[PDB]
RNA sequence: UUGCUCAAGAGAAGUCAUUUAAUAAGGCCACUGUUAAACGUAGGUGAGUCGUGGCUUUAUGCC
């Protein structure tokens, strides 16, 4: 079977908002899969969510990031004047800072061809022909993509700190995400396992799928 | 096209007014640079101004 697609993203700032974070702007340690899933598709100019629905994701952090909270005044639809006052409120938005990760893209149970993993390996190789709109970025769309490419499994032959499907585990990450509630959200439970695996262990893929 | 798409903690503020490190003090008292000698005899040099004036025989030397 065709190797899966290494990619090694760095990136300055992130911020993975926890689903039931509204409150405040509580931050995943790990991006999820559904936003990794989404980076790609903007990655190889695909607006429709569910035209690659089954490919497989597996996340290995390069380094620990350390989370910051920053203050902003992010505005919200509360009023129908645009100029009151009650439209812009403070809250706290946590960020992690010097990101650094591995993501293993793998394509075999996708439906439609040419596959995701096929798309952006395509995309790598003629950045010429790719057809998007908007800059790259994970997480916040003013957090912009500083280091996106082609590696292999010894980028930094280093050890690796990869995200497990653990069902005790801490972190509970969406693979499929609901904009406007939380019904149609999907999760599943995730641990960080110290592991110098170069690849991916079998509990640490994650298939993207409808919440249907 | 990413729990995403939009999102200024923003506008203003003297650390200010006053305060002698001041009053007193000898680095002082003592010291010999004493004693003796044969010059026997053989070593050198760096710098201007331009056409008669008082004596004196032109002379040629003095001021």
């Given at each position: 079977m065709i190797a899966p697609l290494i990619l090694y993203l760095d990136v300055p700032f992130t911020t993975f908002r926890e689903s039931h974070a509204r409150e405040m702007g509580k931050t995943y340690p790990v991006p999820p899969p559904a936003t990794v899933y989404?980076?790609?598709?903007?990655?190889?100019?695909?607006?429709?969510?569910?035209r690659h629905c089954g490919v497989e994701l597996a996340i290995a952090m390069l380094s620990s990031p350390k989370k910051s909270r920053i203050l902003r005044q992010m505005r919200r639809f509360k009023n129908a004047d645009f100029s009151?006052?009650?439209?812009?409120?403070?809250?706290?938005?946590?960020?992690?800072?010097?990101?650094?990760?591995?993501?293993?893209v793998r394509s075999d149970e996708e439906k439609i061809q040419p596959s995701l993993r096929e798309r952006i390996q395509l995309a790598f190789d003629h950045p010429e022909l790719v057809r998007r709109f908007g800059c790259l970025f994970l997480g916040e769309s003013d957090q912009?993509?500083?280091?996106?490419?082609?590696?292999?499994?010894?980028?930094?032959?280093?050890?690796?700190?990869?995200?497990?499907?653990d069902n005790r585990g801490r972190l509970t990450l969406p693979y499929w995400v609901d904009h406007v509630g939380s019904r149609n959200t999907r999760f599943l439970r995730y641990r960080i396992e110290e592991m110098d695996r170069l690849s991916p262990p079998d509990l640490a893929w994650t298939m993207v799928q409808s919440p249907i």
């Open positions: 989404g980076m790609l598709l903007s990655l190889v100019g695909e607006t429709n969510v569910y009151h006052p009650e439209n812009v409120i403070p809250c706290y938005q946590e960020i992690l800072s010097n990101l650094k990760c591995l993501i293993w912009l993509i500083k280091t996106i490419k082609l590696a292999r499994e010894d980028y930094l032959e280093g050890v690796r700190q990869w995200a497990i499907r």
